[PDB]
Amino acid sequence: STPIQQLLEHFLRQLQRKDPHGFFAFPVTDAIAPGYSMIIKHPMDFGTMKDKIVANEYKSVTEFKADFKLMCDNAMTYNRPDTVYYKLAKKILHAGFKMMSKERLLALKRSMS
Numbered sequence: 001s002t003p004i005q006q007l008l009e010h011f012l013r014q015l016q017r018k019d020p021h022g023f024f025a026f027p028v029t030d031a032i033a034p035g036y037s038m039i040i041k042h043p044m045d046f047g048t049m050k051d052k053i054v055a056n057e058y059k060s061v062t063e064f065k066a067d068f069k070l071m072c073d074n075a076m077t078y079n080r081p082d083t084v085y086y087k088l089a090k091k092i093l094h095a096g097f098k099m100m101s102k103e104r105l106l107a108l109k110r111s112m113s
């Protein structure tokens with residue numbers, strides 16, 4: 001494993017901890033959610049993000065953050081605001097961006113020198 005992969009796996013584990021029912025663990029199918037493929041054209045989930053880390057597909061934390069944001073945005077686009085999926089996506093997007101904030105990454109950059 002590489003230092004980037006270890007850091008991204010840590011961020012992903014902490015993010016997955018906020019989803020105990022595993023709503024974001026797997027891709028959303030049309031059988032589970034009707035007309036999903038018709039509304040969401042750029043699907044994303046924690047499993048796809050895990051596979052990208054393992055394959056060393058992320059060049060930076062910004063790229064990882066972009067996939068996480070896409071996943072939350074998709075859930076907030078497809079699902080109405082009063083659903084468990086929209087509510088969890090909004091909660092984890094905020095919590096995730098504070099964990100991977102420019103402030104926290106600058107503090108990590110300073111500890112790398």
Ligand SMILES: CN(C)c1ncc2c(=O)n(C)ccc2n1
Pocket residue numbers: 023024028032033034074075078079085
């Ligand atoms: C059952 N159903 C209608 C439905 N709809 C939307 C979603 C969804 O966005 N995620 C992320 C996970 C499950 C899900 N399930």
